[PDB]
Every structure is written in structure tokens, then in C-alpha cells.
């Protein structure tokens, strides 16, 4: 039905519509994020490292803040924007806070989760810092677990970059 991530509308952290289709033609990594998680440090470091290392090939990281896992994203978008830039020097796009699970789950997440299920084919996001790898057609090709390393993600990202 939906054929890519570009069939969906998302708000950036400033609550204006985000120009999502600018990333079409090259792969992306999309995280759901939290500021007060045990994965926050490792999560933002991996995201940044991958973003810096593959920026020039048209690769980006999008971060969707989410407060559904232990309530570990309590702050507003401006507070999140500041924390993220001061601590980690993350220069990638930070989006508006959303739900990833349930009746108010963002349509884009329902699509990614359905395309790339978790443990035992279950759809639900299990925690903060789950990521989806997206290909050049805007189709999700991998789900990564919270804690997934740079090298774990490169295993799939590198062959993807060399494609098309």
C-alpha cells in the first residue's frame, strides 16, 4: 500500500513540516530517541559517528524523540534540541516528539515496524534507540536493536551505499 517512507508526513522539532523527500535517492538511519535512557550516550555516539562518516554520500540520521519507554523523554523539543547538541554535537535532524506504539503511533512507524518486525516477528518497538535502516528507494531494509554498534550497522549500510 505505502511503498516508501516518503509517503508520510513528519514534523521537525520546531513543529513545522519537515522536508523528508530531500533524502530520497540515498540510505538513511531512523532512531527513536530519549535523553534519560541507559542507551542515550551509546545511542547518540553511534548515530553521530555514522552521520559524520557517511554525510558526504547523502546519508542522514533522523531522530524521533519518544516518551513511551520508562518516560525517559520528558522534556520539550527545544530542551531536547539543546541537550543533544551540547552533549553529543549531533548535527542531524531532530524531529517532533511522537508515539511509536499504540493507537497514536505515527503512521510512518507503523509502516517501518510492519516492514521490518522485531523479535519473533513482533511489530512493537521494545525500547528507546531502536533504529531502521532505509534504502535508496525509501524502503526499510533492517531493524536494529537498541545498543546496535557502528560496526553492526555498517555490515548492512556499506553494501547499501555501494548500490545504485
**Pairwise CA distance, residues 113 & 101, whole Å:** 9
Question: Is 37 annotated in the active site?
Answer: yes
Q: Which of 37, 84, 98, 125 is catalytic?
A: 37
Which domain range does residue 70 map to? 1-164
The neighbouring-strand residues paired with 133 are: 29, 142
**Pairwise CA distance, residues 68 & 88, whole Å:** 23
Element (H, E) at 77: helix 77-88
- Work out how many domains the chain is built from and give that number: 1
* CATH number of the domain residue 1 falls in: 3.40.30.10
User: If phi over 0 gives left and psi between -120 and 50 gives alpha, with beta otherwise, what is residue 160?
Assistant: alpha
Element (H, E) at 110: helix 107-115
Amino acid at each position: 500500500a505505502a511503498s516508501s517512507i516518503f509517503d508520510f508526513e513528519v514534523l521537525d522539532a520546531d513543529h513545522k513540516p519537515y522536508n523528508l523527500v530531500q533524502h530520497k535517492g540515498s540510505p538513511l538511519l531512523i532512531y527513536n530517541v530519549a535523553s534519560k535512557c541507559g542507551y542515550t550516550k551509546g545511542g547518540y555516539e553511534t548515530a553521530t559517528t555514522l552521520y559524520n562518516k557517511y554525510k558526504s554520500q547523502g546519508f542522514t540520521v533522523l531522530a524521533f524523540p519518544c516518551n513511551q519507554f520508562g518516560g525517559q523523554e520528558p522534556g520539550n523539543e527545544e530542551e531536547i534540541k539543546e541537550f543533544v547538541c551540547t552533549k553529543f554535537k549531533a548535527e542531524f535532524p531532530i524531529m517532533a516528539k511522537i508515539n511509536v506504539n499504540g493507537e497514536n503511533a505515527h503512521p510512518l512507524y507503523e509502516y517501518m515496524k510492519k516492514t521490518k518486525p522485531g523479535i519473533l516477528k513482533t511489530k512493537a518497538i521494545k525500547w528507546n534507540f531502536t533504529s531502521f535502516l532505509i534504502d535508496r528507494d525509501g524502503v526499510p531494509v533492517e531493524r536494529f536493536s537498541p545498543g546496535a554498534s557502528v560496526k553492526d550497522i555498517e555490515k548492512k549500510l556499506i553494501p547499501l551505499l555501494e548500490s545504485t
